[PDB]
Design a protein around this motif. Structure first.
Motif: not given
Lengths: 237, 300
Positions: A75-76, A79, A110, A113-115, A117-118
Motif C-alpha cells: 500500500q505504501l 503512495w 487515487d 490524484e491526491v498527491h 491536488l495542487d
C-alpha cells in the motif's frame, strides 16, 4: 478517461505526457527463517516514469531504507510512488510539466490524484494497454544502477538511445514495447538474441546495441518469433 | 397542539405529513391537519394524482408562526403561507375543527419515530441550507440540485448542504496525503466538526435533514449528502464514543422507516458495505448492522 488502442497516436502528439509504472517500486525475495516460517527481504526498487514522445526516463531509485519500520508496504509503495512523481513534477519548470500522467496500474489513480491536488490541470489517466514496463529491470544498465544504489537517487536515461535520429516516436515506442514484451516472456532467449553477435556493442551512453536499420529488422523479427513460440507453449495452441 | 389549515383542495393529491400520508380527491371538503406535535420540525408534502413526478413540500415549525396551505391555480401547486393576523387564524382553525373537516396528526403514544428522525434537525439550520429568508418555512422538491452538484445551475433554488469531497485540498493536509486519505479523522474532527459545524449536533442535524429530503422527495443530491456524511464518520479512525453511539441510533431509525421498495434507489451499496464491513467503525454500528442485515441482506 482511459488510454486504449483507439487513442494510441495521442502518445506521440505535442502535449507532454508521462507513463508511470510502479511495478518495480517494492521488490522482495521470499525466504525461510531458521524456525521454518517465511519472511521477505526487500531489495532496491525503481519508479519507471517515461515520456513516450522523447524517450526521457526519470528512473527514481527506491532504496530499501524507505521501508524501514513501515507497515502495509505494498500500500505504501503506491503512495511513495505518487509522492515521488508529484515531487518530480514540482521539480520541472512549468513548460516541462506534463499535461497528463498515465498510470499503468489502476491502483495508482487515487494516490497520484491526491498527491497532485495542487495540479488540477494535470489529467491523471488509466490505460487498457498491457504495457511490459515491469521488464525494465531486464535492461542490464537500469538493473545495475538500482542494485548498486546506497541511497535514494534519480537517474536520467533516454530509453530510445539515438533511435529518434532515424525513426518516429511511434516506431521507437513499438520497438521498445516489443523488446520489453520479449524480455518479459523469455528474458534469457530475448537477451541471447540481443548480444549473439559480439561485433554489435552497446555504446557507453546507450542501453541497447548499435544495430543498423537492417539489423533492427532482423532483431525485431527474432523478438516477434520468441513472443509467439512462448505463447504457443503457455497455451498449448 | 397546532394546526395547518387548508383553504381548499381543488386538485386530487396525496398529502404527506411527516411519515404519514392521506389521499384527497378533487374538490373534497378537506380543511387541513390538526394535533401537530409542538417541539419538532415537520414537513407537509404533496404528490398530484395527475403527475406523480415532482414530489414537493414544506419544512416548518408551528412555534415560528401560523401556517396554512392554499392551492395556486397559476403555479399549479399547494403553497405554504403565513397568516400574520392571529385572530383571523384562530377563527379559521376553530370553524374547520367544529365542522370536523381536518385530519388529526395520527401519532401513536408509544411511537418516537419522528423524534428519532428529527432529533438534531432545527428550522434555523434548514433555512441556511434552503435560502428563502422572507419565509419562516422551507420549500424542497424532487428536482432541486445541491451546491456541490452545481460545481460538477440556478443558485436561488439550490440545497446549500456542506460540501464534502474526499479528494480536495480541504480534506488533505500537504505532506499527510496518504494518512488523511486512508484516515479522515482530521477532515471530520478539525475541518468539519470544530471548523464548520462547530458541534456533533449540527452535523447530525444536516445528515438527518439530507436523509428526509432523499426519502420524502426522492431528492438525489440529498441522498449523496446523507451517504457522504455517514462515510466521513465511518472512514475516521478517531471519533468520540458519543458520536458513534448516536450515529448507530440515527441510522437505525432511518433504515427502519425507509419504504422497503425504495432500498434499491435510496441506498448506495458501496457506501453501506464499506461502512458496516471494511471501515474503522465496522464494529461500532451494532443496531444499524442488525437492521440492515435482517431487512436488506440483498444490498449486502
Amino acid at each position: 478517461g482511459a488510454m486504449n488502442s483507439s487513442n494510441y497516436a495521442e502518445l506521440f502528439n505535442n502535449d507532454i505526457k508521462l507513463f508511470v509504472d510502479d511495478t518495480n517500486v517494492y521488490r522482495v525475495t521470499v525466504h525461510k527463517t531458521f524456525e521454518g516460517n517465511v519472511a521477505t527481504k526487500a531489495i532496491n526498487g525503481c519508479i519507471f516514469t517515461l515520456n513516450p514522445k522523447t524517450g526521457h526516463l526519470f528512473l527514481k531509485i527506491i532504496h530499501t531504507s524507505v521501508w524501514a519500520g513501515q507497515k502495509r508496504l505494498s500500500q505504501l509503495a503506491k503512495w511513495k510512488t505518487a509522492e515521488e512523481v508529484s515531487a518530480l513534477v514540482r521539480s520541472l519548470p512549468k513548460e516541462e510539466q506534463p499535461k497528463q500522467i498515465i498510470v499503468t496500474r489502476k491502483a495508482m489513480l487515487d494516490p497520484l490524484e491526491v498527491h497532485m491536488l495542487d495540479f488540477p490541470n494535470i489529467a491523471i489517466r488509466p490505460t487498457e494497454l498491457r504495457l511490459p514496463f515491469s521488464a525494465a529491470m531486464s535492461i542490464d544498465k537500469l538493473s545495475d544502477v538500482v542494485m548498486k544504489a546506497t541511497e535514494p537517487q534519480m537517474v536520467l536515461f533516454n530509453i530510445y538511445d539515438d533511435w529518434l535520429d532515424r525513426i518516429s516516436s511511434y516506431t521507437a515506442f513499438s520497438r521498445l514495447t516489443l523488446l520489453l514484451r520479449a524480455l518479459k516472456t523469455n528474458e534469457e532467449s530475448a537477451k541471447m538474441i540481443l548480444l549473439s553477435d559480439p561485433t554489435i556493442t552497446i555504446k557507453s551512453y546507450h542501453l541497447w546495441p548499435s544495430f543498423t536499420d537492417e539489423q533492427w529488422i532482423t532483431i525485431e523479427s527474432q523478438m516477434r518469433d520468441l513472443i509467439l513460440t512462448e505463447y504457443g507453449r503457455k497455451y498449448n495452441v | 397542539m397546532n394546526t395547518v389549515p387548508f383553504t381548499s383542495a381543488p386538485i386530487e393529491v396525496t398529502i404527506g405529513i411527516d411519515q404519514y400520508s392521506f389521499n384527497v380527491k378533487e374538490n373534497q371538503p378537506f380543511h387541513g391537519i390538526k394535533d401537530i406535535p409542538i417541539g419538532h420540525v415537520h414537513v407537509i408534502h404533496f404528490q398530484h394524482a395527475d403527475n406523480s413526478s415532482m414530489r414537493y413540500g414544506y419544512w416548518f415549525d408551528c412555534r415560528m408562526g401560523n401556517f396554512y396551505i392554499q392551492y395556486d391555480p397559476k403555479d399549479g401547486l399547494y403553497k405554504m403561507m403565513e397568516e400574520r393576523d392571529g385572530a383571523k387564524f384562530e377563527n379559521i382553525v376553530h370553524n374547520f375543527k367544529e365542522r370536523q373537516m381536518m385530519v388529526s396528526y395520527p401519532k401513536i403514544d408509544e411511537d418516537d419515530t419522528w423524534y428519532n428522525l428529527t432529533e438534531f434537525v432545527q428550522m434555523d439550520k434548514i433555512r441556511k441550507i434552503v435560502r428563502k429568508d422572507e419565509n419562516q418555512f422551507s420549500y424542497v422538491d424532487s428536482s432541486m440540485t445541491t451546491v456541490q452538484e452545481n460545481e460538477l445551475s440556478d443558485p436561488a433554488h439550490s440545497l446549500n448542504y456542506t460540501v464534502i469531497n474526499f479528494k480536495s485540498r480541504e480534506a488533505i493536509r500537504p505532506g499527510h496525503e496518504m494518512e488523511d486519505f486512508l484516515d479522515k479523522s482530521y477532515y471530520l474532527n478539525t475541518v468539519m466538526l470544530q471548523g464548520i459545524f462547530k458541534n456533533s449536533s449540527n452535523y447530525f442535524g444536516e445528515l438527518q435533514f439530507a436523509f428526509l429530503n432523499a426519502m420524502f422527495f426522492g431528492n438525489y443530491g440529498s441522498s449523496l449528502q446523507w451517504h457522504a456524511m455517514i462515510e466521513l464518520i465511518c472512514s475516521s479512525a478517531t471519533v468520540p464514543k458519543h458520536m458513534l453511539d448516536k450515529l448507530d441510533e440515527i441510522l437505525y431509525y432511518q433504515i427502519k422507516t425507509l419504504p422497503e421498495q425504495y432500498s434499491d434507489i435510496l441506498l448506495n451499496e458501496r457506501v453501506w458495505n464499506i461502512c458496516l464491513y471494511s471501515s474503522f467503525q465496522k464494529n461500532s454500528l451494532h443496531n444499524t448492522e442488525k437492521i440492515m442485515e435482517n431487512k436488506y441482506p440483498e444490498l449486502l
